[PDB]
CSV table of C-alpha atoms in Angstrom, one decimal:
chain,number,residue,atom,x,y,z
A,1,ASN,CA,-26.1,20.2,-50.9
A,2,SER,CA,-29.5,19.7,-51.1
A,3,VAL,CA,-31.8,20.1,-55.2
A,4,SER,CA,-35.3,19.7,-55.1
A,5,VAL,CA,-37.6,18.1,-56.8
A,6,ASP,CA,-41.6,18.4,-57.3
A,7,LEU,CA,-43.4,14.5,-57.3
A,8,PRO,CA,-46.9,14.1,-57.6
A,9,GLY,CA,-49.4,14.6,-54.4
A,10,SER,CA,-47.7,18.7,-54.4
A,11,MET,CA,-44.7,16.4,-53.0
A,12,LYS,CA,-41.0,17.7,-52.7
A,13,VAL,CA,-38.2,15.5,-52.0
A,14,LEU,CA,-34.6,17.0,-51.5
A,15,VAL,CA,-31.6,15.2,-53.1
A,16,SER,CA,-28.0,15.3,-51.7
A,17,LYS,CA,-26.5,16.4,-54.7
A,18,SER,CA,-23.3,14.4,-53.6
A,19,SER,CA,-23.1,11.1,-53.2
A,20,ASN,CA,-23.3,9.5,-49.6
A,21,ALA,CA,-23.9,7.2,-48.6
A,22,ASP,CA,-22.3,4.3,-50.3
A,23,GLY,CA,-22.7,4.7,-53.8
A,24,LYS,CA,-25.2,6.1,-52.5
A,25,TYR,CA,-27.4,10.2,-52.6
A,26,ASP,CA,-29.8,11.2,-49.4
A,27,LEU,CA,-33.3,11.9,-49.6
A,28,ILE,CA,-35.3,13.4,-47.0
A,29,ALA,CA,-38.9,15.3,-47.5
A,30,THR,CA,-41.9,16.4,-45.5
A,31,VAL,CA,-45.3,15.2,-45.5
A,32,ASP,CA,-48.3,16.7,-43.0
A,33,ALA,CA,-44.7,18.2,-40.7
A,34,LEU,CA,-43.2,14.8,-40.5
A,35,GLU,CA,-40.0,14.5,-41.9
A,36,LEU,CA,-39.4,11.2,-44.0
A,37,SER,CA,-35.9,9.8,-45.1
A,38,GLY,CA,-34.4,7.8,-47.2
A,39,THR,CA,-31.5,6.5,-49.8
A,40,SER,CA,-31.3,5.6,-52.9
A,41,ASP,CA,-28.7,4.6,-55.8
A,42,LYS,CA,-30.4,6.7,-57.6
A,43,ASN,CA,-30.3,10.4,-57.3
A,44,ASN,CA,-33.0,12.0,-59.4
A,45,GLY,CA,-35.7,12.2,-55.7
A,46,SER,CA,-36.9,8.3,-56.6
A,47,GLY,CA,-36.9,5.9,-53.7
A,48,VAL,CA,-37.9,5.3,-50.2
A,49,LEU,CA,-38.5,7.3,-47.5
A,50,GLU,CA,-39.5,6.3,-44.4
A,51,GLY,CA,-40.6,8.2,-40.7
A,52,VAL,CA,-42.2,8.1,-38.0
A,53,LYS,CA,-44.7,8.8,-35.8
A,54,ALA,CA,-44.6,10.6,-31.8
A,55,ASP,CA,-47.5,7.5,-31.5
A,56,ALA,CA,-45.8,5.0,-33.2
A,57,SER,CA,-47.1,5.0,-36.7
A,58,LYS,CA,-45.2,4.4,-39.4
A,59,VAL,CA,-45.6,6.3,-42.5
A,60,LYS,CA,-43.5,5.4,-46.4
A,61,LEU,CA,-43.1,7.7,-49.2
A,62,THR,CA,-42.7,5.3,-52.4
A,63,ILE,CA,-41.6,6.5,-55.5
A,64,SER,CA,-41.0,5.6,-58.6
A,65,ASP,CA,-38.1,5.2,-60.7
A,66,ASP,CA,-38.8,7.7,-62.9
A,67,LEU,CA,-41.2,9.3,-60.7
A,68,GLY,CA,-44.3,8.8,-62.4
A,69,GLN,CA,-46.4,7.8,-59.5
A,70,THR,CA,-46.2,8.5,-55.6
A,71,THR,CA,-47.0,6.4,-53.0
A,72,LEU,CA,-47.8,7.1,-50.0
A,73,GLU,CA,-48.8,4.8,-47.2
A,74,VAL,CA,-49.4,4.6,-42.6
A,75,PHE,CA,-49.5,2.3,-40.9
A,76,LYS,CA,-50.3,1.0,-38.1
A,77,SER,CA,-46.9,0.6,-35.9
A,78,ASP,CA,-46.8,-3.0,-36.5
A,79,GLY,CA,-45.7,-1.6,-40.7
A,80,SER,CA,-48.3,-3.4,-42.0
A,81,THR,CA,-51.7,-3.0,-41.4
A,82,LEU,CA,-53.4,0.2,-43.3
A,83,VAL,CA,-54.4,3.2,-42.1
A,84,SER,CA,-53.9,5.2,-45.2
A,85,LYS,CA,-52.5,4.7,-48.6
A,86,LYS,CA,-52.6,7.9,-51.2
A,87,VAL,CA,-51.5,7.1,-55.1
A,88,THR,CA,-51.0,9.9,-57.7
A,89,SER,CA,-49.5,9.3,-60.6
A,90,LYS,CA,-48.2,12.4,-62.5
A,91,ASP,CA,-51.3,13.1,-64.4
A,92,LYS,CA,-52.9,14.6,-62.0
A,93,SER,CA,-54.7,11.6,-61.3
A,94,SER,CA,-54.9,9.4,-57.7
A,95,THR,CA,-56.9,7.0,-55.2
A,96,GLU,CA,-57.4,8.5,-51.0
A,97,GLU,CA,-57.6,5.5,-49.2
A,98,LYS,CA,-58.6,5.5,-45.9
A,99,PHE,CA,-58.9,2.3,-43.4
A,100,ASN,CA,-60.6,0.9,-40.2
A,101,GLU,CA,-59.0,0.0,-37.2
A,102,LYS,CA,-58.9,-3.5,-38.4
A,103,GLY,CA,-56.8,-2.5,-41.6
A,104,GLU,CA,-59.5,-2.7,-44.1
A,105,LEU,CA,-61.1,-1.2,-46.8
A,106,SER,CA,-63.5,2.2,-45.2
A,107,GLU,CA,-63.2,4.8,-47.9
A,108,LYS,CA,-61.6,4.8,-51.4
A,109,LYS,CA,-62.2,8.7,-53.7
A,110,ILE,CA,-60.8,8.1,-57.0
A,111,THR,CA,-59.8,11.3,-59.3
A,112,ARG,CA,-59.0,11.9,-62.2
A,113,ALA,CA,-56.7,14.1,-64.6
A,114,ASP,CA,-60.1,16.5,-65.0
A,115,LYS,CA,-61.1,16.6,-60.7
A,116,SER,CA,-63.9,14.6,-61.8
A,117,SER,CA,-63.9,12.4,-59.1
A,118,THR,CA,-66.0,9.0,-57.3
A,119,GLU,CA,-66.3,8.5,-53.6
A,120,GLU,CA,-66.8,5.1,-51.4
A,121,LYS,CA,-67.7,4.3,-48.1
A,122,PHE,CA,-67.5,1.1,-47.1
A,123,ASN,CA,-69.7,-0.3,-43.7
A,124,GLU,CA,-68.5,-2.3,-41.0
A,125,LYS,CA,-69.3,-5.6,-43.8
A,126,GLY,CA,-67.7,-4.3,-46.2
A,127,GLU,CA,-70.4,-3.0,-47.5
A,128,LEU,CA,-71.7,0.1,-49.5
A,129,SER,CA,-73.1,2.5,-47.3
A,130,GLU,CA,-72.4,5.9,-49.8
A,131,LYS,CA,-71.5,6.8,-53.5
A,132,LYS,CA,-71.1,10.2,-54.6
A,133,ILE,CA,-69.6,10.3,-58.4
A,134,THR,CA,-68.2,14.1,-59.0
A,135,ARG,CA,-68.2,15.1,-62.4
A,136,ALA,CA,-65.6,17.7,-64.5
A,137,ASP,CA,-68.3,20.3,-64.1
A,138,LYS,CA,-68.9,20.0,-60.3
A,139,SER,CA,-72.5,18.6,-61.0
A,140,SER,CA,-72.8,15.2,-58.9
A,141,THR,CA,-74.8,12.3,-58.3
A,142,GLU,CA,-75.2,11.1,-54.2
A,143,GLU,CA,-76.5,8.1,-53.3
A,144,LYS,CA,-76.5,6.7,-49.5
A,145,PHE,CA,-78.1,2.5,-48.7
A,146,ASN,CA,-79.1,1.6,-45.1
A,147,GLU,CA,-78.6,-1.9,-44.2
A,148,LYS,CA,-80.5,-3.9,-46.5
A,149,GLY,CA,-78.7,-2.3,-49.2
A,150,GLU,CA,-81.6,-0.8,-50.2
A,151,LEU,CA,-81.6,3.3,-51.1
A,152,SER,CA,-82.6,5.7,-48.9
A,153,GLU,CA,-81.5,9.0,-49.7
A,154,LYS,CA,-79.6,10.3,-53.3
A,155,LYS,CA,-78.6,13.8,-53.9
A,156,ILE,CA,-78.1,15.1,-57.5
A,157,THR,CA,-76.2,18.3,-57.7
A,158,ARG,CA,-76.9,20.2,-61.0
A,159,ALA,CA,-74.0,22.5,-62.1
A,160,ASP,CA,-75.8,25.3,-61.4
A,161,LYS,CA,-75.6,24.3,-58.2
A,162,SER,CA,-79.5,23.7,-57.7
A,163,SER,CA,-80.1,19.9,-56.2
A,164,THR,CA,-82.7,18.0,-55.1
A,165,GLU,CA,-82.6,15.7,-52.3
A,166,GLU,CA,-84.8,13.1,-51.8
A,167,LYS,CA,-85.6,10.6,-48.9
A,168,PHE,CA,-86.7,7.5,-49.0
A,169,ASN,CA,-89.3,4.7,-46.9
A,170,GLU,CA,-89.5,1.2,-45.9
A,171,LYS,CA,-91.5,0.8,-48.9
A,172,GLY,CA,-89.8,3.1,-51.7
A,173,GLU,CA,-91.7,5.9,-51.1
A,174,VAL,CA,-90.7,10.0,-51.8
A,175,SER,CA,-90.7,10.4,-47.9
A,176,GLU,CA,-88.8,13.4,-48.2
A,177,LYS,CA,-87.8,16.0,-50.7
A,178,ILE,CA,-85.3,19.5,-51.1
A,179,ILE,CA,-85.0,20.8,-53.9
A,180,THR,CA,-82.7,23.7,-53.9
A,181,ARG,CA,-82.6,26.4,-56.1
A,182,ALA,CA,-79.4,28.4,-57.9
A,183,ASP,CA,-80.4,31.9,-55.7
A,184,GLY,CA,-79.9,30.0,-53.0
A,185,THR,CA,-83.2,29.5,-51.7
A,186,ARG,CA,-84.9,25.9,-51.1
A,187,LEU,CA,-88.4,24.2,-51.3
A,188,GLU,CA,-89.0,22.0,-47.9
A,189,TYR,CA,-91.4,19.0,-48.7
A,190,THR,CA,-91.7,16.6,-45.5
A,191,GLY,CA,-94.7,13.8,-44.2
A,192,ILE,CA,-94.6,12.6,-47.9
A,193,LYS,CA,-97.8,11.0,-48.3
A,194,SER,CA,-98.7,7.9,-51.3
A,195,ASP,CA,-100.8,10.0,-53.2
A,196,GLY,CA,-97.6,13.0,-53.5
A,197,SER,CA,-98.8,15.1,-51.2
A,198,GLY,CA,-97.2,16.7,-47.9
A,199,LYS,CA,-96.0,19.8,-46.2
A,200,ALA,CA,-94.1,22.1,-47.3
A,201,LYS,CA,-91.6,25.0,-46.2
A,202,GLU,CA,-89.8,27.9,-48.4
A,203,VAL,CA,-86.5,28.8,-46.4
A,204,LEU,CA,-86.6,32.6,-48.2
A,205,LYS,CA,-83.1,35.2,-47.8
A,206,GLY,CA,-84.4,36.1,-43.9
A,207,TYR,CA,-88.2,34.6,-43.4
A,208,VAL,CA,-89.8,30.6,-44.3
A,209,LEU,CA,-92.9,30.8,-45.4
A,210,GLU,CA,-95.1,26.9,-44.7
A,211,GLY,CA,-98.1,25.3,-46.7
A,212,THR,CA,-98.8,22.1,-48.6
A,213,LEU,CA,-97.3,20.4,-51.1
A,214,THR,CA,-100.4,18.3,-53.2
A,215,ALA,CA,-99.3,16.9,-57.3
A,216,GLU,CA,-100.6,19.8,-58.7
A,217,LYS,CA,-99.0,22.3,-56.9
A,218,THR,CA,-97.4,23.6,-54.7
A,219,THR,CA,-98.2,26.6,-52.1
A,220,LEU,CA,-97.4,28.9,-49.3
A,221,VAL,CA,-99.6,31.0,-46.7
A,222,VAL,CA,-99.0,34.3,-45.4
A,223,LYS,CA,-103.1,35.4,-43.2
A,224,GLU,CA,-103.4,38.9,-41.6
A,225,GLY,CA,-107.3,39.7,-40.2
A,226,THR,CA,-109.7,39.0,-42.6
A,227,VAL,CA,-106.8,38.5,-45.9
A,228,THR,CA,-104.5,35.0,-47.2
A,229,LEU,CA,-102.0,35.7,-49.8
A,230,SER,CA,-101.2,32.4,-50.9
A,231,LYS,CA,-98.0,31.8,-53.0
A,232,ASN,CA,-98.2,29.0,-55.7
A,233,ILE,CA,-95.4,27.6,-56.5
A,234,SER,CA,-95.7,25.2,-60.4
A,235,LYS,CA,-94.1,21.4,-61.4
A,236,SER,CA,-91.9,23.6,-63.0
A,237,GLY,CA,-91.2,26.0,-60.6
A,238,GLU,CA,-93.6,28.8,-62.3
A,239,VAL,CA,-94.4,31.0,-59.4
A,240,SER,CA,-98.5,33.0,-59.3
A,241,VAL,CA,-99.4,34.3,-56.3
A,242,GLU,CA,-103.2,35.1,-55.0
A,243,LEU,CA,-105.4,37.5,-52.5
A,244,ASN,CA,-108.9,36.3,-50.8
A,245,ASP,CA,-110.3,38.6,-48.2
A,246,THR,CA,-113.1,37.0,-46.0
A,247,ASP,CA,-114.2,41.3,-45.9
A,248,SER,CA,-117.8,41.9,-47.1
A,249,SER,CA,-117.1,45.7,-46.5
A,250,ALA,CA,-116.9,47.5,-49.4
A,251,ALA,CA,-114.9,49.8,-47.7
A,252,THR,CA,-111.8,47.9,-46.4
A,253,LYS,CA,-111.7,44.9,-48.8
A,254,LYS,CA,-108.9,43.8,-50.2
A,255,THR,CA,-109.4,42.5,-53.6
A,256,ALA,CA,-105.4,41.3,-55.3
A,257,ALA,CA,-105.0,41.3,-59.7
A,258,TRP,CA,-101.3,38.7,-61.1
A,259,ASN,CA,-99.4,39.6,-63.8
A,260,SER,CA,-97.5,37.6,-64.9
A,261,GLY,CA,-96.2,38.7,-66.4
A,262,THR,CA,-94.5,41.7,-64.9
A,263,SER,CA,-94.6,38.9,-61.3
A,264,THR,CA,-96.5,41.0,-59.3
A,265,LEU,CA,-99.5,41.2,-58.0
A,266,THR,CA,-101.5,44.8,-57.1
A,267,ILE,CA,-104.0,45.5,-54.4
A,268,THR,CA,-107.1,47.4,-54.3
A,269,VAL,CA,-109.1,48.5,-51.6
A,270,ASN,CA,-112.6,50.8,-52.2
A,271,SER,CA,-111.8,51.0,-56.0
A,272,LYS,CA,-107.7,52.1,-54.7
A,273,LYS,CA,-104.5,50.6,-56.2
A,274,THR,CA,-103.1,50.6,-53.0
A,275,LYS,CA,-100.1,48.2,-53.3
A,276,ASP,CA,-98.0,46.1,-55.0
A,277,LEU,CA,-96.1,43.0,-54.1
A,278,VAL,CA,-93.1,42.3,-56.7
A,279,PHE,CA,-91.8,38.6,-56.3
A,280,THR,CA,-88.4,38.6,-58.3
A,281,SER,CA,-86.1,36.3,-60.6
A,282,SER,CA,-84.5,35.7,-57.0
A,283,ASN,CA,-87.2,34.9,-55.0
A,284,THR,CA,-87.7,37.9,-52.7
A,285,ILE,CA,-90.5,40.0,-52.5
A,286,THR,CA,-90.9,44.0,-52.6
A,287,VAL,CA,-94.1,45.8,-51.5
A,288,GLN,CA,-94.3,49.6,-53.5
A,289,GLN,CA,-97.1,52.1,-52.6
A,290,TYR,CA,-98.9,53.7,-54.8
A,291,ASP,CA,-100.2,57.4,-54.1
A,292,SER,CA,-103.5,58.4,-52.2
A,293,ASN,CA,-105.0,58.7,-55.5
A,294,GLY,CA,-104.3,55.0,-57.2
A,295,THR,CA,-103.1,55.5,-60.3
A,296,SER,CA,-99.5,55.9,-59.2
A,297,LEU,CA,-96.7,54.2,-57.3
A,298,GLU,CA,-94.7,56.7,-55.2
A,299,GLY,CA,-91.3,56.4,-53.5
A,300,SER,CA,-89.3,53.5,-54.1
A,301,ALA,CA,-90.3,49.9,-54.0
A,302,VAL,CA,-88.6,48.6,-50.8
A,303,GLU,CA,-87.3,44.9,-50.8
A,304,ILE,CA,-88.6,42.3,-47.5
A,305,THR,CA,-86.2,40.8,-45.3
A,306,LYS,CA,-88.5,39.4,-42.6
A,307,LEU,CA,-92.0,38.1,-42.4
A,308,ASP,CA,-94.0,40.5,-40.3
A,309,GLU,CA,-93.1,43.1,-43.6
A,310,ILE,CA,-95.1,40.9,-45.4
A,311,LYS,CA,-98.1,41.0,-42.6
A,312,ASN,CA,-97.5,44.7,-42.7
A,313,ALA,CA,-98.5,44.9,-46.4
A,314,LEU,CA,-101.3,42.5,-46.5
A,315,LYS,CA,-103.0,45.2,-44.0
């Protein structure tokens, strides 16, 4: 006895096949598990449907006469103070708004047919506190403002999901910076000074390396016994690795050489190559031992999953 009509905003309205009331067609729709009902002079699915929540909140669905737009409003029990409002066009465009307890705009998101969007949030004072722009390629920019209307944080996300997030101090200097790589690992810079120096932490799969930031380079350090392994990262993300041992015994002292073509550090002790450490394109480390004569690698390389395995390699 009904006919189901598809509407903008993933909604559906059932229209009585038969005219009655009058003269009129009956309309019913379910939105968020609440049934709305109305009547119309048309039988195409257009009209106004209303419902009332258990807490007396009023819900109103307005479907335009040519079905080109739906408007879904939620009000307080007075039927006038807004809680939310979603307008959706036939072309899948939409505007979704939320309101504070006074009925004033607190959030607004505008989405285009290509799924790009802008979202703004407003504070109790009606002032912009956050703004996010998302492009069709899923890259985005996000800004957050403090109570002086000043930029407090900014995050730039690329289409490959890598990103740079900055926080700013009251002087407008970058005080913290997080670089997220396309592989998911991160460089976290904290306590950034006026000269661009600070503390550095690299967050890898299974462990964190710690070190420093300067304007010249990031350097992460692992110490074991008299040996120090230094992982340098240039501004452009190029990794190079060095090793120093303060041991002065020709018998036990470690030395190492870096091959930037292979991203491999080769350790030597007592004129025999002992290990290769490979720093891979996915920001992992593998280790493999040379046979006891020091001229060929044996077994298979092992992918390091905890910090202690790096330290064991440096013994």
